[PDB]
Design an enzyme around this catalytic site. Structure first.
Site, PDB file in Angstrom:
ATOM      1  N   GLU A  55       1.836  -1.803   6.181  1.00  0.00           N
ATOM      2  CA  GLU A  55       0.578  -1.311   5.626  1.00  0.00           C
ATOM      3  C   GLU A  55      -0.546  -1.894   6.507  1.00  0.00           C
ATOM      4  O   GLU A  55      -0.426  -3.049   6.951  1.00  0.00           O
ATOM      5  CB  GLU A  55       0.407  -1.880   4.240  1.00  0.00           C
ATOM      6  CG  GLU A  55      -0.987  -1.820   3.705  1.00  0.00           C
ATOM      7  CD  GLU A  55      -1.152  -2.482   2.346  1.00  0.00           C
ATOM      8  OE1 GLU A  55      -0.961  -3.715   2.320  1.00  0.00           O
ATOM      9  OE2 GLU A  55      -1.509  -1.798   1.336  1.00  0.00           O
ATOM     10  N   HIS A  63      -2.628   8.100   7.205  1.00  0.00           N
ATOM     11  CA  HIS A  63      -3.293   7.957   5.925  1.00  0.00           C
ATOM     12  C   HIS A  63      -2.991   9.177   5.041  1.00  0.00           C
ATOM     13  O   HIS A  63      -3.201  10.269   5.503  1.00  0.00           O
ATOM     14  CB  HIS A  63      -4.802   7.817   6.157  1.00  0.00           C
ATOM     15  CG  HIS A  63      -5.640   7.670   4.907  1.00  0.00           C
ATOM     16  ND1 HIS A  63      -5.848   6.464   4.275  1.00  0.00           N
ATOM     17  CD2 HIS A  63      -6.367   8.581   4.220  1.00  0.00           C
ATOM     18  CE1 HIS A  63      -6.673   6.635   3.265  1.00  0.00           C
ATOM     19  NE2 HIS A  63      -7.004   7.917   3.213  1.00  0.00           N
ATOM     20  N   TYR A  97       0.527   8.999  -0.818  1.00  0.00           N
ATOM     21  CA  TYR A  97      -0.866   8.826  -1.293  1.00  0.00           C
ATOM     22  C   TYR A  97      -1.618  10.186  -1.313  1.00  0.00           C
ATOM     23  O   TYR A  97      -2.817  10.200  -1.508  1.00  0.00           O
ATOM     24  CB  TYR A  97      -1.682   7.863  -0.406  1.00  0.00           C
ATOM     25  CG  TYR A  97      -1.269   6.399  -0.539  1.00  0.00           C
ATOM     26  CD1 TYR A  97      -1.801   5.572  -1.561  1.00  0.00           C
ATOM     27  CD2 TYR A  97      -0.361   5.835   0.381  1.00  0.00           C
ATOM     28  CE1 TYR A  97      -1.449   4.262  -1.642  1.00  0.00           C
ATOM     29  CE2 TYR A  97       0.011   4.531   0.312  1.00  0.00           C
ATOM     30  CZ  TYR A  97      -0.524   3.734  -0.685  1.00  0.00           C
ATOM     31  OH  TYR A  97      -0.134   2.415  -0.662  1.00  0.00           O
TER      32      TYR A  97
END
Ligand SMILES: Nc1ncnc2c1ncn2[C@@H]1O[C@H](CO)[C@@H](OP(=O)(O)OC[C@H]2O[C@@H](n3ccc(=O)[nH]c3=O)[C@H](O)[C@@H]2OP(=O)(O)O)[C@H]1O
Ligand SMILES: Nc1ncnc2c1ncn2[C@@H]1O[C@H](CO)[C@@H](OP(=O)(O)OC[C@H]2O[C@@H](n3ccc(=O)[nH]c3=O)[C@H](O)[C@@H]2OP(=O)(O)O)[C@H]1O
EC number: 2.4.2.36
Lengths: 523, 523
Positions: free
Chosen positions: A148, A21, A65
């Protein structure tokens, strides 16, 4: 039947199932204390069916991200954490990403959010295969092999979180640590040392500045507001003079090799920078980046042409950044508002290094299918096309949401995509703001979307998007149906999707190039 | 523990888990009736630990197990079937392939074979994660990213068997069908239509035989046993004469471009063939391929040099094969046997088409890590090196078995590898004949191994092996320890692994090129 929405060849039960993540600055540490649903916000998705904790199988895509949301183009990169479910987890690969169809087919309640149901004991009993929880898996992007994962928020609470990388710990300038991490993905493979480059650039600027002949050319400057044509013509001479400096010998040698590297392109690009950088933008790195990021002609200073990164050493790169920078400082007085000082060697160089970094990341990546599969629309060097014919249709009865792919490529050197304009019918057909994105050679870039005139929604990529020979993108448009009402063909305000390219002067005004593709609103 | 020999990232429980298995001519239909352990034979392996039914995730690697084992080099291919387990199946990826270590680590009996213990309810309750059976999983080969699966024989009776491809059914010539199937693997792709090449070859031959200058050059042939020099001298003038036929027009343009393509080389390859083809061999295709497959210079005919397949169309290929054929016919009388131009335009061209097929199959594959990782032993154009320093040491106390890798490469053109001579201590250290193999750019080739003098085991590849610029091999040596009694260093008869290359004449006798690598018996 499950069989219509689930791919069993991609579905399995695994012990100690790990995924990554991308974490924001200020969260790397706290996130290692546990996964929990944020108290407000979109909690993973604009669409309630899709809210959940997101992870991916590739730690470099996770890294995409990690950048400070308030300053996406220049902000700090946080990090990447690895999240592990203890025991057994069932990964259930989906064949469609239409929450509605998923509920219909899996025989789920169509009144309850899909991802919430995924965390129920009954779903798990039915689809888990003896596992503790199920994690929905979908393809990450066009031109990407990654995956994902969409985890149930409650179920995510069982995840054990370890640090993979904390970019900030490096103490590196800008987004160096991040792009150098991602550069490990190809062991392709341009991985310059941006620190050595900053040093060499700085060193060379100082040197060129003192060169007797450079200073004399400097004297010949109008040092006042002169026309665009006059400013460029003085910079073509300034460039010629400066290319004879021994500290630029290698650049001088390459300059003749490709027309992309000509004096005339260094001057067109230097005048265009001066023109778009006002006192305020100059004083802000993020504004500076947003402003340079939409200019055409970056392949000249980057030495990128005909599908290869030619300026491939910390030295010819430092030579090119120094020369252009020096040119921007001369162009500021002739065309801009500020002065030669500050900006040219500070924010100009920093901001431009981040754009080299973004373009080199693309070139290190495998080319997203060059070829258009439906006839493309060509304009100002770009070529846009529906990925398939069906992508061009909005079925009037589609339920849940619909997705549309459009291939974007440009012909040669790095040309920018400023944004995307999408048709809406407020309260029936909305843009799903979490699922619309652009994928560049498989790197997925999120968008910032707002309502503009005429039921059109304007989406800006989060990081700079460039297409060229070798770097192709996929715009993925996700539409959300917020009403069971009838959608008519002559009911939409707009019937096309617009692509905004580089910014150019029209009528003495800066506008963005614009390519449109039209929709067929049909049953 | 399990984590010492189980790769968990590759271990998972899957519904309707399918894999592929290459099937021999005569079994493509009956195998579909059910997977049953042969009444006799090695049933999957020379080592009891490893007997079980074998499959792989890749159907083209499965295709490489379909060729008739009586006529391995030229017999026909049978086909591939897809085997699927109904329900849930556990895939247990292994970090090692030593069965003693896996038994010891998984806390199994040391008295019972591993794969036999793999089908017990206890093992399944233990490692199955809720699945009906467990399948072992191991890397397919070096230079390959395929997976080998090893099923337990009784658990394998549950597999449902489906036809994937039956090559015989295609009705094609030789191993054509098998070979174009494999060409589907890469769409580096050169997939010549050998039926068209067989015809243009035939047509060029006839056209050439009636050629004015050709027939007269023929008239000048001493037409009888002359020496190697005179035979070669005539053949080169022959080549020039033919190279000017309107029909070898393409091949003429390309003869001069690369030295490998010269007449002097067509002439030498032609004399060597005529020299090596006797009546018995000229009458058997299998025996022709074996003979031709161990000769140097096949790269002149294939148009293969500097890591590229130059003769990449059915026309230059037919042209090349036609000319070669004629020259072989002319050579037969001068330095050969009563086996004349009958063999030349038939078996030699069928035999030769098959070897272009093998080499072209290696080039269509990704080149196996070109670099030698330890200093290579060079000789006759070949370079052979221990994969790692450890591959060169036979630890005295190793228990169970041990494997050693050797990278094999040649400098430019296709050089064969006739075989390998392996050391032994016939009671204690044995060649595991199932696990020993050569992997050419990921294509895994089995061996036919026999005992020779001096406690040496000669292993021959089942299909032709060629190394060169762009085609690299990994020879994998699997030793099996038949006795607990420890090994003493001076115990072993040979302390080297011998690599046999191309056939050459030494002292007027045909011998094979030989390279040695020296082992180190340590602790
Ligand atoms: N302890 C915590 N537990 C849970 N979340 C925490 C925690 N601390 C911080 N967060 C942040 O909370 C968000 C939601 O989980 C994520 O970032 P974001 O800025 O909203 O992240 C922006 C977007 O990226 C998605 N995204 C993030 C990383 C990744 O690898 N993949 C991905 O798809 C997010 O779901 C999010 O989607 P939406 O904005 O559409 O909601 C996450 O990093
Ligand atoms: N109904 C049946 N049930 C099961 N097997 C049947 C049946 N009918 C025929 N067979 C054959 O019996 C052998 C054992 O499975 C295999 O062929 P082989 O010629 O011995 O095959 C030769 C070798 O190839 C291995 N190999 C074959 C194909 C594959 O893709 N992978 C692999 O490694 C085999 O284990 C074998 O090893 P050993 O030679 O070391 O025993 C198989 O094709």
């Amino acid at each position: 039947g499950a069989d219509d929405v689930v791919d069993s060849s991609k579905s399995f039960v695994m012990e100690n199932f790990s995924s990554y993540h991308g974490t924001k600055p200020g969260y790397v540490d706290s996130i290692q204390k546990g996964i929990q649903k944020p108290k407000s916000g979109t909690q993973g998705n604009y669409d309630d069916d899709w809210k959940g904790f997101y992870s991916t199988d590739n730690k470099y895509d996770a890294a995409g991200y990690s950048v400070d949301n308030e300053n996406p183009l220049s902000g700090k990169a946080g990090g990447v954490v690895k999240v592990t479910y203890p025991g057994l987890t069932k990964v259930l690969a989906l064949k469609v990403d239409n929450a509605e169809t998923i509920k219909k087919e899996l025989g789920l309640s169509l009144t309850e959010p899909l991802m919430e149901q995924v965390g129920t004991e009954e779903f798990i009993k039915r689809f888990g295969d003896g596992a503790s929880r199920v994690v929905l898996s979908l393809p990450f992007a066009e031109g990407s092999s990654s995956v994902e994962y969409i985890n149930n928020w409650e179920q995510a609470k069982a995840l054990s979180v370890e640090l993979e990388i904390n970019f900030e710990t490096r103490g590196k300038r800008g987004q160096d640590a991040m792009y150098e991490y991602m550069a490990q993905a190809c062991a392709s493979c341009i991985n310059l040392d941006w620190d050595v480059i900053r040093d060499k650039t700085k060193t060379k600027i100082e040197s060129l500045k003192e060169h007797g002949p450079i200073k004399n050319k400097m004297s010949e400057s109008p040092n006042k507001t002169v026309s665009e044509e006059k400013a460029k013509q003085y910079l073509e001479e300034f460039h010629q003079t400066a290319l004879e400096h021994p500290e630029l010998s290698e650049l001088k040698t390459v300059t003749g090799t490709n027309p992309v590297f000509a004096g005339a392109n260094y001057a067109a690009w230097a005048v265009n920078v001066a023109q778009v950088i006002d006192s305020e933008t100059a004083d802000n790195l993020e504004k500076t980046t947003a402003a340079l990021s939409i200019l055409p002609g970056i392949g000249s200073v980057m030495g990128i042409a005909d599908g290869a990164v030619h300026h491939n050493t910390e030295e010819i790169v430092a030579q090119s950044i120094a020369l252009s920078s020096l040119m921007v400082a001369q162009a500021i007085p002739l065309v801009g508002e500020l002065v030669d000082i500050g900006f040219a060697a500070y924010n100009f160089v920093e901001s431009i290094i981040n754009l080299f970094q973004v373009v080199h990341n693309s070139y290190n990546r495998p080319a997203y299918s060059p070829g258009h599969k439906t006839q493309p629309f060509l304009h100002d060097g770009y070529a846009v096309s529906w990925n398939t014919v069906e992508d061009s249709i909005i079925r009037t009865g589609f339920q849940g949401e619909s997705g549309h792919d459009i291939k974007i490529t440009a012909e040669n050197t790095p040309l920018p995509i400023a944004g995307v304009l999408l048709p809406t019918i407020p309260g029936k057909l909305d843009v799903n703001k979490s699922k619309t994105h652009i994928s560049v050679n498989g790197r997925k870039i999120r968008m910032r979307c707002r309502a503009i005139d005429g039921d059109v929604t304007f989406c800006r990529p989060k990081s700079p998007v460039y297409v060229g020979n070798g770097v192709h993108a996929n715009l993925h448009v996700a539409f959300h149906r917020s009403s069971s009402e009838k959608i008519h063909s002559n009911e939409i305000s707009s019937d096309s999707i617009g692509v905004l390219g580089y910014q150019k002067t029209v009528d003495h005004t800066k506008v963005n190039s614009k390519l449109s593709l039209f929709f067929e609103i049909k049953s």
